[PDB]
Enzyme design. Structure first.
Site, PDB file in Angstrom:
ATOM      1  N   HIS A  16      52.865  36.706  57.519  1.00  0.00           N
ATOM      2  CA  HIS A  16      53.017  35.983  57.865  1.00  0.00           C
ATOM      3  C   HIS A  16      54.446  35.314  57.360  1.00  0.00           C
ATOM      4  O   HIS A  16      55.381  36.026  56.658  1.00  0.00           O
ATOM      5  CB  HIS A  16      52.389  34.836  57.167  1.00  0.00           C
ATOM      6  N   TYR A  73      47.739  27.084  49.567  1.00  0.00           N
ATOM      7  CA  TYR A  73      47.024  27.369  48.545  1.00  0.00           C
ATOM      8  C   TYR A  73      47.498  26.130  47.552  1.00  0.00           C
ATOM      9  O   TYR A  73      48.352  25.116  47.990  1.00  0.00           O
ATOM     10  CB  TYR A  73      48.574  27.835  47.174  1.00  0.00           C
ATOM     11  N   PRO A  89      44.687  38.107  40.637  1.00  0.00           N
ATOM     12  CA  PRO A  89      44.789  37.543  42.068  1.00  0.00           C
ATOM     13  C   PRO A  89      45.570  36.649  42.764  1.00  0.00           C
ATOM     14  O   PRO A  89      46.269  36.708  44.403  1.00  0.00           O
ATOM     15  CB  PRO A  89      43.280  36.646  42.432  1.00  0.00           C
ATOM     16  N   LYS A 107      49.501  40.480  44.123  1.00  0.00           N
ATOM     17  CA  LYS A 107      50.545  41.516  43.866  1.00  0.00           C
ATOM     18  C   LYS A 107      49.320  43.001  43.292  1.00  0.00           C
ATOM     19  O   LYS A 107      50.239  43.824  43.514  1.00  0.00           O
ATOM     20  CB  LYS A 107      51.500  40.938  42.969  1.00  0.00           C
ATOM     21  N   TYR A 133      57.671  36.634  45.831  1.00  0.00           N
ATOM     22  CA  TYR A 133      56.197  35.993  47.127  1.00  0.00           C
ATOM     23  C   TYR A 133      56.349  37.800  48.176  1.00  0.00           C
ATOM     24  O   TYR A 133      55.454  38.130  47.748  1.00  0.00           O
ATOM     25  CB  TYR A 133      56.071  35.170  47.799  1.00  0.00           C
TER      26      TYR A 133
HETATM   27  C1  LIG Z   1      39.458  38.603  44.687  1.00  0.00           C
HETATM   28  C2  LIG Z   1      40.938  39.244  44.969  1.00  0.00           C
HETATM   29  C3  LIG Z   1      41.857  39.211  45.656  1.00  0.00           C
HETATM   30  C4  LIG Z   1      42.126  40.408  45.663  1.00  0.00           C
HETATM   31  N1  LIG Z   1      43.774  39.663  46.356  1.00  0.00           N
HETATM   32  C5  LIG Z   1      44.337  40.685  46.714  1.00  0.00           C
HETATM   33  C6  LIG Z   1      46.273  39.599  47.672  1.00  0.00           C
HETATM   34  O1  LIG Z   1      45.802  39.829  48.855  1.00  0.00           O
HETATM   35  N2  LIG Z   1      46.922  41.172  47.345  1.00  0.00           N
HETATM   36  C7  LIG Z   1      47.101  41.927  46.631  1.00  0.00           C
HETATM   37  O2  LIG Z   1      47.966  42.827  46.609  1.00  0.00           O
HETATM   38  N3  LIG Z   1      46.444  42.639  46.101  1.00  0.00           N
HETATM   39  C8  LIG Z   1      45.115  41.934  45.651  1.00  0.00           C
HETATM   40  N4  LIG Z   1      44.093  41.868  44.737  1.00  0.00           N
HETATM   41  C9  LIG Z   1      44.015  43.481  43.939  1.00  0.00           C
HETATM   42  C10 LIG Z   1      43.608  44.735  44.801  1.00  0.00           C
HETATM   43  O3  LIG Z   1      42.329  44.148  45.481  1.00  0.00           O
HETATM   44  C11 LIG Z   1      43.136  45.344  43.717  1.00  0.00           C
HETATM   45  O4  LIG Z   1      44.891  45.350  43.148  1.00  0.00           O
HETATM   46  C12 LIG Z   1      43.309  47.504  44.358  1.00  0.00           C
HETATM   47  O5  LIG Z   1      41.599  47.259  44.711  1.00  0.00           O
HETATM   48  C13 LIG Z   1      43.513  48.226  43.371  1.00  0.00           C
HETATM   49  O6  LIG Z   1      43.645  49.848  44.942  1.00  0.00           O
HETATM   50  P1  LIG Z   1      42.851  50.759  43.526  1.00  0.00           P
HETATM   51  O7  LIG Z   1      42.898  51.620  44.199  1.00  0.00           O
HETATM   52  O8  LIG Z   1      43.873  51.204  42.306  1.00  0.00           O
HETATM   53  O9  LIG Z   1      41.743  50.178  43.062  1.00  0.00           O
HETATM   54  P2  LIG Z   1      40.368  50.144  43.656  1.00  0.00           P
HETATM   55  O10 LIG Z   1      39.918  49.683  44.229  1.00  0.00           O
HETATM   56  O11 LIG Z   1      39.405  49.857  42.053  1.00  0.00           O
HETATM   57  O12 LIG Z   1      39.418  51.786  42.813  1.00  0.00           O
HETATM   58  C14 LIG Z   1      38.996  52.854  42.002  1.00  0.00           C
HETATM   59  C15 LIG Z   1      38.566  53.554  43.100  1.00  0.00           C
HETATM   60  O13 LIG Z   1      38.098  54.625  42.204  1.00  0.00           O
HETATM   61  C16 LIG Z   1      36.779  54.919  41.533  1.00  0.00           C
HETATM   62  N5  LIG Z   1      36.122  55.447  40.175  1.00  0.00           N
HETATM   63  C17 LIG Z   1      36.238  54.928  39.046  1.00  0.00           C
HETATM   64  N6  LIG Z   1      35.413  55.323  38.067  1.00  0.00           N
HETATM   65  C18 LIG Z   1      35.366  56.523  38.860  1.00  0.00           C
HETATM   66  C19 LIG Z   1      35.265  57.431  37.823  1.00  0.00           C
HETATM   67  N7  LIG Z   1      34.987  57.465  36.892  1.00  0.00           N
HETATM   68  N8  LIG Z   1      35.522  59.016  38.701  1.00  0.00           N
HETATM   69  C20 LIG Z   1      35.500  59.273  40.227  1.00  0.00           C
HETATM   70  N9  LIG Z   1      35.524  58.032  41.321  1.00  0.00           N
HETATM   71  C21 LIG Z   1      35.327  56.967  40.066  1.00  0.00           C
HETATM   72  C22 LIG Z   1      35.538  53.364  42.373  1.00  0.00           C
HETATM   73  O14 LIG Z   1      35.063  53.851  42.343  1.00  0.00           O
HETATM   74  C23 LIG Z   1      36.922  52.980  43.358  1.00  0.00           C
HETATM   75  O15 LIG Z   1      36.042  53.715  44.142  1.00  0.00           O
HETATM   76  C24 LIG Z   1      42.903  41.318  44.799  1.00  0.00           C
HETATM   77  C25 LIG Z   1      41.552  41.285  44.075  1.00  0.00           C
HETATM   78  C26 LIG Z   1      40.323  40.644  44.139  1.00  0.00           C
HETATM   79  C27 LIG Z   1      39.555  40.938  43.492  1.00  0.00           C
HETATM   80  N1  LIG Z   2      46.931  35.811  46.386  1.00  0.00           N
HETATM   81  C1  LIG Z   2      45.646  35.695  47.494  1.00  0.00           C
HETATM   82  C2  LIG Z   2      45.972  35.718  49.342  1.00  0.00           C
HETATM   83  C3  LIG Z   2      45.692  36.002  49.826  1.00  0.00           C
HETATM   84  C4  LIG Z   2      43.345  36.289  49.235  1.00  0.00           C
HETATM   85  C5  LIG Z   2      43.190  36.930  50.332  1.00  0.00           C
HETATM   86  O1  LIG Z   2      43.398  37.021  51.489  1.00  0.00           O
HETATM   87  O2  LIG Z   2      41.682  37.901  49.818  1.00  0.00           O
HETATM   88  C6  LIG Z   2      44.056  36.258  48.153  1.00  0.00           C
HETATM   89  C7  LIG Z   2      44.670  36.323  46.919  1.00  0.00           C
END
Ligand SMILES: Cc1cc2nc3c(=O)[nH]c(=O)nc-3n(C[C@H](O)[C@H](O)[C@H](O)COP(=O)(O)OP(=O)(O)OC[C@H]3O[C@@H](n4cnc5c(N)ncnc54)[C@H](O)[C@@H]3O)c2cc1C
Ligand SMILES: Nc1ccc(C(=O)O)cc1
Ligand SMILES: Cc1cc2nc3c(=O)[nH]c(=O)nc-3n(C[C@H](O)[C@H](O)[C@H](O)COP(=O)(O)OP(=O)(O)OC[C@H]3O[C@@H](n4cnc5c(N)ncnc54)[C@H](O)[C@@H]3O)c2cc1C
Ligand SMILES: Nc1ccc(C(=O)O)cc1
EC number: 1.14.13.2
Lengths: 394, 394
Positions: A72, A201, A293, A297, A385
């Site tokens: 994009h 947005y 969200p 980031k 962004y």
């Molecule tokens: C609605 C939504 C939209 C988002 N949109 C965006 C976007 O477009 N762009 C962007 O940059 N970010 C976005 N994010 C953020 C992004 O999804 C998170 O920052 C990302 O999941 C971080 O990954 P992680 O691996 O740190 O953690 P997680 O994905 O939470 O993974 C952590 C893992 O550790 C495991 N775990 C937990 N506890 C234990 C334990 N005690 N022992 C062993 N394993 C364990 C969990 O089961 C999980 O599998 C969004 C988040 C949400 C909810």
């Molecule tokens: N800022 C955001 C933009 C897009 C999405 C998404 O596509 O899931 C989530 C957050």
């Protein structure tokens, strides 16, 4: 049982770090509480910064993303009956962002790890961390009844907001910064063509709305919703009617609706912990910080923490420069705070807040008008962004 | 007694408007509650935008300003033990600001009006406005006991925040937007050389501090202070000790102190009223809006309201286009809101707020770090600081 780097969590952070490490010759074991299917069920992110795209390439897991991801060059912001396009590519000096679902990125990494034969223990129950300040830390967990021990040199806590790693650091060594927003996002995934080729947005009097996508035939939509809401109270039809009410008429008119594949509510929060390490334990991703969200980031900051940890670990193992690891927190926090600031700003200008006085509403509207009407204002949005540059280290 | 335009208030707005009008052949009478000396005793503003400098030139009252005013190409912001200079000239595309006291500007205008022989009635007591929606509005006032009547075509309310003009509009026709800050500024004027050739705005843990000037041998300093403070509780020595404690050591070290010529506390407030007119009454300056001093926009917005009113009046009298006057409020409000937004932003990032959580303090600090470290961020400050362009009308 022994390894060089123990990784808690098989979400994107843990998998990406594990892949980068394996490819460089540093053995690592990943311990995950859930099953592969459970992890794969989380929809979450859709937008990736260029830095994360490059890291996936470096980990050698970019084939599907290069084929399926959508690049994009812009994004739209609708407010007060007007749509303004921010040309990200032009305003940021050529950078763009990539839309490729988090579920897909995770699937790519999991397949890559399986093929390389690196160790991953799913359903690793009751993970506990020990001797974090010793020269020989270890992890204990339970696999089908029996408690096993894993010895390692370092532990990377990539276990998300509810993980065990951050809880294992003496609370007195940590400084917590947190803000809870009085609303959440109700998201809906549908197998329908997106309403636009770029994200929209929308700041509307009824609340925030966001039109996103996963591919040419899969859409992801969000609407701001009070914290008191329960997903079961939102039928697909109620959602479509609400979404339509928050978008510009010309956009709502060509919106193709359809049954939801997934529907969920995510609360908005800002959370940062300082420092991000303790002894031989280093926190990465959601384990160390949460951003609302709005700025997309979260997953992207996780990528930069991982990029930083991996490079420091490499220096430590390959070059015997173990002392550089003390700089981990300082390096990551600089980027984390600027991304938190941007996510906070986006959130405050796009959402409708409870009990807002007339002055604040007018200021909110003026922030939009100023930033979207000034070349300098546009550039501050665009550069943030697409993602600020990663620091180089040393 | 009759005139074309009656002007309530002989502060800078009323005088500037009266001068512009007189020079164009539109008779006007100014009514002022106080005496010339009282008006001349107010210190207030020190920073003028280029637009205001050009308006003074157009009014033909720029001789002393061209000689005595200091042109500044930059300004400094100190925070967290560091000083960052914003090159206004470079970042705004060549614009600068001028430091020339409001007292001096007012003195120049008063001398100019006296020499032209235009009417000014000081000590005009109990001014009342009548028949605002009629084709023939009039003003009544008292001069040494007897109540006189002044007939006119239009009335310009340039009577400041506590004037009679805004109070004369049916409250139901007005929308008020206001924010009160929990602090004020304690200002001190001294016949001492300024500590720097450019202004220094300082965010310090003890509160905000500002080092300004009036000439090469006259300084103006300010420190943030709680609303509960009384000026009599602040001796000159207490002020200097406090100011020194809030500035970078290398700046405090070369600060030349001295006895105060004036010392006062000004509360911080944001206030906007919509619309800014009613029938044949048009509000200008502080009568229609207040901005906290942090952005140095108050007197400057008054200048743009006046520039706008004058040009519309000219069209009305010279060209018979009286209908253009209905656009006054719409035109001024666009500029007023952007200046209010900037003044509000400056205020929130430079001052220390009561009961601030850890997250907000960190965000405040990060706002500074981001805006002062990014080329795009710097440009948003600079273009707003030098002043956004005046709209052209029609
Ligand atoms: C609605 C939504 C939209 C988002 N949109 C965006 C976007 O477009 N762009 C962007 O940059 N970010 C976005 N994010 C953020 C992004 O999804 C998170 O920052 C990302 O999941 C971080 O990954 P992680 O691996 O740190 O953690 P997680 O994905 O939470 O993974 C952590 C893992 O550790 C495991 N775990 C937990 N506890 C234990 C334990 N005690 N022992 C062993 N394993 C364990 C969990 O089961 C999980 O599998 C969004 C988040 C949400 C909810
Ligand atoms: N800022 C955001 C933009 C897009 C999405 C998404 O596509 O899931 C989530 C957050
Ligand atoms: C600490 C301080 C610092 C500031 N610094 C700056 C800066 O550097 N740059 C900048 O742009 N702005 C700055 N300002 C703002 C600027 O001083 C004001 O916006 C400016 O005075 C507005 O002028 P005015 O003519 O509208 O109103 P005023 O100066 O208030 O004059 C209004 C006049 O109307 C008269 N009057 C009132 N009631 C009546 C009545 N009922 N009948 C007749 N006459 C009446 C009053 O006596 C007064 O003479 C600062 C203000 C303060 C307090
Ligand atoms: N922002 C401000 C800058 C300077 C002065 C002043 O010189 O009086 C006041 C406000």
């Amino acid at each position: 049982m022994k390894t060089q780097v123990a990784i808690i969590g098989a979400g994107p952070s843990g998998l990406l770090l594990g892949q980068l490490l394996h490819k460089a010759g540093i053995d690592n074991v990943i311990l995950e509480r859930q099953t592969p299917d459970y992890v794969l069920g989380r929809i979450r992110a859709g937008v990736l910064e260029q830095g994360m795209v490059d890291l996936l390439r470096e980990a050698g897991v970019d084939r599907r993303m290069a084929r399926d991801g959508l690049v994009h060059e812009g994004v739209e912001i609708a407010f007060a009956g007007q749509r303004r396009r921010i040309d990200l590519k032009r305003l940021s000096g050529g950078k763009t962002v990539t839309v490729y679902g988090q579920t897909e990125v995770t699937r790519d990494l999991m397949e890559a790890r399986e093929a390389c034969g690196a160790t991953t223990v799913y359903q690793a129950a009751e993970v506990r961390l020990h001797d974090l300040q010793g020269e020989r830390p270890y992890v204990t967990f339970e696999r089908d009844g029996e408690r096993l021990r894993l010895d390692c040199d370092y532990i990377a806590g990539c276990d998300g907001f509810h993980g065990i790693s951050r809880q294992s650091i003496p609370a007195e060594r940590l400084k917590v910064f947190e803000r809870v927003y009085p609303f959440g996002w109700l998201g809906l995934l549908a197998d329908t063509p997106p309403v636009s080729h770029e994200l929209i947005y929308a700041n509307h009097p009824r609340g925030f709305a966001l039109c996103s996508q996963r591919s040419a035939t899969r859409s992801r939509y969000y609407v701001q919703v009070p914290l008191s809401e329960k997903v079961e109270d939102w039928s697909d039809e109620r959602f479509w009617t609400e979404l339509k009410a928050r978008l510009p008429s010309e956009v709502a008119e060509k919106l193709v609706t359809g049954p939801s594949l997934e529907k969920s509510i995510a609360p908005l929060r800002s959370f940062v912990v300082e420092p991000m390490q303790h002894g031989r334990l280093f926190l990465a991703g959601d384990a160390a910080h949460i951003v609302p969200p709005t700025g997309a980031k979260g997953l992207n900051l996780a990528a930069s923490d991982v990029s930083t940890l991996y490079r420091l670990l490499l220096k430590a193992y390959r070059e015997g420069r173990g002392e550089l690891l003390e700089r981990y927190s300082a390096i990551c926090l600089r980027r984390i705070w600027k991304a938190e600031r941007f996510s906070w700003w986006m959130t405050s200008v796009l959402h409708r807040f409870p009990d807002t006085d007339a002055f604040s509403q007018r200021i909110q509207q003026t922030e939009l008008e100023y930033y979207l009407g000034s070349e300098a204002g546009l550039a501050t949005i665009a550069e943030n962004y697409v993602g600020l540059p990663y620091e180089e280290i040393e």
